[PDB]
Amino acid sequence: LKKIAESFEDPSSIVVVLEFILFALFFPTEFNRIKGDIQNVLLLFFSRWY
Amino acid sequence: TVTNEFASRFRTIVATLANVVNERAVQDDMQKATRSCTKQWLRHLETQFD
C-alpha cells in the first residue's frame, strides 16, 4: 500500500476509512494483497476512536 | 508496540480533562462552537504527543 499519513483527529478523517472500503469493493483482490498494510492505518483509527 | 503506551496514557488523561471541561461548559451554558474548539484543541494535543 502507498503510505497514508493520517492521525484521525477530526471525524472528517473517516474519508480515509471509506476510501479503503471502496477499495475493498471495487478491487477485492488487490485489497486482499495489501490488507495488512491497510490494517496498520485502521489500527490507528480504532485506537483513536475506540 | 504498534502503539506508544506513554502517548496512550496521554490520551486517557486528555479524555478525562475533556469530560471535565465539558462538564464545566454545560454547567456554564457555554456555546457549542467554543466547546468544539476546546475539544479540537485537546485532540490536537493528543496527536502532537503521539
Curated annotation (Swiss-Prot), chain B:
Q: Where in the cell is it found?
A: Virion
The subunit structure is:
Homodecamer; each decamer is made up of two conformers of VP2, called VP2A and VP2B. 12 homodecamers assemble to form an icosahedral capsid.
Q: What does this protein do?
A: Inner capsid protein that self-assembles to form an icosahedral capsid with a T=2 symmetry, which consists of 120 copies of VP2, with channels at each of its five-fold vertices. This capsid constitutes the innermost concentric layer of the viral mature particle.
How is this protein named in the record? Answer: Inner capsid protein VP1
Q: Which residues form the signal peptide?
A: none
Q: Which organism is it from?
A: Bombyx mori cytoplasmic polyhedrosis virus (BmCPV)
Similarity field: Belongs to the turreted BTV-fold inner capsid family.
